């Protein structure tokens, strides 16, 4: 009976709320109150990557920390050599409305998708010498919002149709579908071990998924608006989400609740991207306001600002060795900061 | 050799310059409308599980790419942001005196959106023949859904479009005034609304868009060539 099930849902919600409030014996802020402040950290633009005709929507670092792919909505991916600013590759896309791109951890493939509802895999190591579309994964009924490689053969995607998916690239069909979100899934982050991944999905909730079983381990709430960005903490036991309510928020999987919130009264614009430094002490968040902010993830005070983009900061990413952070903006530039 | 890599980068950049020329000289339009609007027929008259459709046509040797969302959910507040750089939004609305208020709200949201706040809207008050028939029949009254229409009278400067009843003229100009009031309520001038009374049969539609794009681009040139 519908009303009976509603009562049961409310009772279970209250039970979960009480269970997670009982564990809130302290706060991250209180426990970190005695830790030495990070101080004001200043980052300078070491490189500016020019060549995209339109706004950049996504970028991803290679695992070697030197090559990085960026997607722009002129319908083009560019593989840059960040050390020299050389354009290693330029891949024209069939659909110009790309909203995400990914770099395979082996470096053999890139992935990209968008309003076409398709995730195209491009092979970077063709014997012909040219980059080719190895596969194009169809089956999402909404625009492709994010995609991350688990492996040369497995890719996890999210879409505006409210579902995530795990694909078998060789067969090109959905090995698993992850359902439970009620809004557009705006981002996903893969855990370091690639056994779990979190997703933020335009319903003010983040969800933790186990790829092998294929269902939601946990649901985290506390954001007041759509979540645009989500990133896993380096040790994999926590993650950070940025939302349209102009705040970042750090959740802990084991405590199953919010641990911290990064917000300042002068910031009244949405957050487009988030990332952690290698140690996890710095949380770098890009904003609809044209500059990124670097937060002390332990004390949640603004440790610095990356200003220098003339438009919306759309994408943000730290290298695997932590040497630099790339920020790509709607002004069609990527800037490497150090 | 690093020099060979730099030479490859330079060749990539040359190709990118060619693509930049082609990209700059082509005009991109976003076609929006509800189910009842005849935007599909407008697309079908522009000739010469996918989430987006492109129709590329040409007028006086200038190329237009018009994009219409396909398989998407009705929550548009995220993918609409992808179109903050198009030259115009062709917003098609059915004159069905009732979905008119829903269309007005759609137009208002498109108009006041932060990322679409500099995009001009070409407004097609589509299906004018149906509006004329519905007004002449007299069975449905606009006052039921827009009581302010009880006080409305056609402005003197309004074009008569001869052969047209005063009643249908009053109705159509009130409907146009609703959208124009929404568009002028902003008080910024960053972008303009270009209303048109159209029917999907209209062969003039393409030309209309062209004549509107000429204006929109002109407004950009005024700023790009230091004339304002």
């Amino acid at each position, epitope marked *: 009976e519908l009303d009976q099930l509603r009562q049961e849902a409310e009772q279970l919600k209250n039970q979960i709320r009480d269970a997670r409030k009982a564990c809130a014996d302290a706060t991250l802020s209180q426990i970190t109150n005695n830790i030495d402040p990070v101080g004001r950290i200043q980052m300078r633009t070491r490189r500016t990557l020019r060549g995209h005709l339109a706004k950049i929507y996504a970028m991803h670092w290679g695992t070697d920390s030197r090559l990085l792919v960026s997607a722009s909505q002129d319908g083009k991916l560019i593989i840059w050599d960040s050390y020299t600013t050389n354009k290693v590759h330029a891949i024209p896309l069939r659909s110009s409305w790309v909203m995400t791109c990914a770099y395979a951890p082996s470096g053999n493939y890139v992935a990209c998708g968008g309003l076409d509802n398709i995730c195209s895999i491009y092979n970077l190591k063709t014997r012909e010498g040219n980059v080719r579309v190895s596969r194009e994964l169809a089956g999402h009924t909404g625009y492709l919002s994010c995609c991350r490689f688990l492996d040369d053969n497995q890719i996890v995607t999210s879409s505006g149709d409210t579902t995530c998916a795990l694909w078998d690239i060789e067969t090109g069909q959905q090995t698993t579908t992850f359902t439970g979100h009620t809004g557009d899934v705006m981002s996903l982050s893969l855990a370091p071990d690639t056994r779990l991944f979190v997703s933020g999905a335009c319903d003010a909730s983040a969800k933790l998924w186990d790829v092998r079983e294929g269902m939601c381990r946990q649901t985290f709430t506390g954001h007041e608006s759509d979540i645009n960005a989500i990133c896993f903490f380096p040790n994999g036991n926590a993650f950070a989400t940025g939302s349209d*309510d102009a705040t970042c928020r750090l959740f802990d999987l084991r405590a199953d609740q919010e641990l911290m919130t990064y917000s300042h009264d002068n910031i009244i614009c949405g957050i487009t991207s988030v990332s952690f430094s290698k140690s996890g002490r710095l949380l770098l968040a890009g904003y609809d306001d044209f500059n990124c902010n670097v937060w002390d993830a332990l004390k949640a005070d603004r440790a610095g600002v990356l200003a220098g983009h003339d438009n919306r900061v759309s994408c943000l990413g730290v290298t695997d060795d932590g040497m630099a952070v790339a920020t790509g903006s709607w002004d069609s530039f990527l800037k490497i900061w150090n | 050799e690093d020099k060979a890599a730099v030479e490859r980068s330079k060749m990539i950049e040359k190709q990118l310059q060619k693509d930049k020329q082609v990209y700059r000289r082509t005009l991109r339009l976003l076609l929006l409308g509800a189910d009842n609007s005849g935007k599909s027929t407008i697309v079908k008259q522009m000739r010469i599980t996918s989430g987006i459709f492109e129709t590329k046509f040409q007028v006086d040797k200038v190329n237009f790419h018009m994009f219409d969302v396909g398989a998407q959910r009705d929550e548009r507040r995220k993918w609409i942001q992808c179109f903050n750089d198009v030259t115009a939004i062709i917003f098609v609305v059915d004159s069905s005196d009732n979905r008119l208020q*829903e269309a007005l709200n759609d137009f208002k949201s498109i108009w006041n959106n932060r990322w679409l706040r500099t995009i001009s809207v070409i407004l097609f008050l589509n299906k004018q023949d149906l509006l004329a028939e519905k007004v002449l029949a007299g069975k449905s009254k606009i006052e039921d859904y827009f009581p302010e229409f009880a006080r409305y009278t056609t402005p003197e400067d309004a074009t008569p479009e001869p052969g047209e009843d005063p009643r249908v003229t009053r109705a159509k100009y009130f409907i146009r005034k609703e959208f124009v009031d929404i568009s002028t309520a902003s008080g910024d001038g960053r972008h303009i609304c270009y209303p048109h009374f159209t029917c999907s049969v209209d062969t003039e539609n393409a030309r209309r868009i062209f004549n509107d794009c000429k204006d929109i681009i002109l407004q950009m040139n005024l700023r790009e060539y230091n004339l304002v």
Partner: nanobody, 128 residues
Framework: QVQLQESGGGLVQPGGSLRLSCAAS????????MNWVRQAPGKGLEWVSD????????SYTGSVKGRFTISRDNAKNTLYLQMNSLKPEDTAVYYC?????????????????????RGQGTQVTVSS
């Protein structure tokens, strides 16, 4: 947890009066422009009215103008719809929606596919 709880409603005689209320929790009520939406039997959701952050700007649909009046109490985190002269056409489930974002002027909140920031709604029935 962002949640909106509508209360008030039930059966009312034609030409009567009825006050709908919504209690809002899980977000700062002041920053968001609020809306009243409704769904009539065998029909889609239709926007009824909206009120800005501070209550200075208000808007109604034509079929409701003059009859209903929208209000908000930021201190109490409440949204009110005082309806007068009810009609049989007003029989519908009334939901309280809000803006997806905390300072925008626009809305995208009448969608059927489970808009995340509206309540369950309350039934309002008008019949003699």
């Amino acid at each position: 947890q962002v949640q909106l709880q509508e209360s008030g409603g039930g059966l009312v005689q034609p030409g009567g009066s009825l006050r709908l209320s919504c209690a809002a929790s899980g977000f700062t009520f002041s920053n968001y422009k609020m809306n009243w939406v409704r769904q009539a039997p065998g029909k889609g959701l239709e926007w009824v009215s909206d009120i800005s952050q501070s209550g200075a700007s208000i808007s109604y649909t034509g079929s409701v103008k003059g009859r209903f009046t929208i209000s908000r109490d930021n201190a109490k985190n409440t949204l009110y719809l005082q309806m007068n002269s009810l009609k049989p056409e007003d029989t519908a489930v009334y939901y309280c929606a809000r803006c997806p974002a905390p300072f925008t002027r626009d809305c995208f909140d009448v969608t059927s596919t489970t808009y995340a920031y509206r309540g369950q709604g309350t039934q309002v029935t008008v019949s003699s």
